[PDB]
Amino acid sequence: EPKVAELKQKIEDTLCPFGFEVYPFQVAWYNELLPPAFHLPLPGPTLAFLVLSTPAMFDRALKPFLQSCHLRMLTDPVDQCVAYHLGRVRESLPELQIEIIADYEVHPNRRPKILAQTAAHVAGAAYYYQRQDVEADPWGNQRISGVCIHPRFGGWFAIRGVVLLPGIEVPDLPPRKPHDCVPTRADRIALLEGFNFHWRDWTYRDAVTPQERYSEEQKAYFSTPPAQRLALLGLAQ
Numbered sequence: 001e002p003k004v005a006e007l008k009q010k011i012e013d014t015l016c017p018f019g020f021e022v023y024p025f026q027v028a029w030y031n032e033l034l035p036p037a038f039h040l041p042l043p044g045p046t047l048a049f050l051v052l053s054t055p056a057m058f059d060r061a062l063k064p065f066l067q068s069c070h071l072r073m074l075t076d077p078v079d080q081c082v083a084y085h086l087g088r089v090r091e092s093l094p095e096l097q098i099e100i101i102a103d104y105e106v107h108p109n110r111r112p113k114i115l116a117q118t119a120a121h122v123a124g125a126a127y128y129y130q131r132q133d134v135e136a137d138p139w140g141n142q143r144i145s146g147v148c149i150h151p152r153f154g155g156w157f158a159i160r161g162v163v164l165l166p167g168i169e170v171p172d173l174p175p176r177k178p179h180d181c182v183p184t185r186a187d188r189i190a191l192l193e194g195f196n197f198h199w200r201d202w203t204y205r206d207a208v209t210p211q212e213r214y215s216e217e218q219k220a221y222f223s224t225p226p227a228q229r230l231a232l233l234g235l236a237q
C-alpha cells in the first residue's frame with residue numbers, strides 16, 4: 001500500500017493540476033473479466049493506474065495546450081493534449097519502466113488497445129453499466145454499448161488512459177468497488193437508451209446529479225472530431 005501511495009502521489013502531482021484524476025488497480029482485476037484476446041501480458045499483481053478527465057481538463061489542459069509548441073496537425077487536439085500529459089508521467093518517474101495507453105489507441109485490426117470502461121470499473125473510478133446489468137432487457141438483436149457513470153460528475157467526464165508499471169507488483173492492493181450510483185433497473189434502462197440512441201443531447205450524463213458539468217464552451221467544442229477543429233476552418237474555407 002505505501003508503495004502505491006508514493007507512486008500515486010507523483011502521478012497526481014503531474015496530472016491533477018490539469019484536471020485529471022487517477023485510480024490504482026491490479027492488472028489481474030482487469031484480465032479476470034475479459035476473454036484471452038483482451039488480456040494484458042503482465043503478472044496479475046502488476047500495478048496500474050486508470051486516468052480520467054474531469055470537466056476542469058478543458059480549461060486547465062486543453063486550452064493552454066492549444067497555445068503550445070506541442071500542437072500538431074491532423075489529430076484531435078484533445079487526444080494530443082492527453083498524449084502530452086501521459087508522456088509527462090513517464091518523465092516524472094524516470095527510474096521506472098512505465099507503459100502508457102490512451103483511450104483512443106487501436107491495434108491495426110481496429111480492436112482497442114485497452115478497454116477503458118472495464119479498467120474504470122475495477123479501479124473503482126466509475127461503475128460500468130452494461131446490457132448485462134439489466135435483466136429482461138427490452139433491446140433485441142442489436143448492439144447496446146455500456147456506459148460508465150462517475151459518482152461525482154455523472155457522465156460529464158471521460159476515460160483517458162491507463163498507466164502500467166511492469167515490475168511493480170502489489171498483490172495486497174485491496175479492491176475498491178465502484179459506486180453503484182444508478183442502482184435500479186428502470187434507471188439503468190433509461191441510462192442505456194440515452195447513451196446509445198440520444199447521446200448528442202447530453203442528457204445521459206445527468207444520470208446522477210453532477211457536482212459540475214462541462215461548460216457550454218466545452219459542449220460547443222465537442223461538436224464532431226473531423227469537422228470540429230482541424231477540418232474546422234472548414235466553415236471559413
Ligand code: COB
Nearest residue numbers: 033103112114115116117118121128145147148158159199
Ligand atoms: C466488446 C467491447 C468493444 N468496446 C470498444 O471497442 C470501445 C472502444 C471506444 C474507443 C471506447 C474507448 C476504449 N478504448 O474503451 C469509446 N468509444 Co465510444 C467513442 N464509441 C465507440 C464506437 C462504438 C463501439 C463501442 N462503444 O464499443 C462508437 C464510435 C460508436 C462510439 C461511440 C461513442 N462512444 C462514446 C463515448 C463517449 C465513449 N466512447 C467510449 C466507450 C469511451 C469510454 C471513450 C472515452 N474517452 O471515455 C466513451 C464513454 C465514456 C463513459 N463510459 O462514460 C460516444 C458518446 C461518442 C462520444 N461523445 O465520443 C458514443 C456513445 C454511443 C455508443 N458507445 O454506442 C468506440 C469504439 C469507443 O467492449 P465491451 O465493454 O462492450 O465488452 C467487454 C467484454 C469484452 O469481451 O468484456 C468485458 N466484460 C465482460 N464481462 C464483464 C466485463 C466488464 C466488467 C466491468 C464486468 C463487471 C463484467 C466487457 O463487457
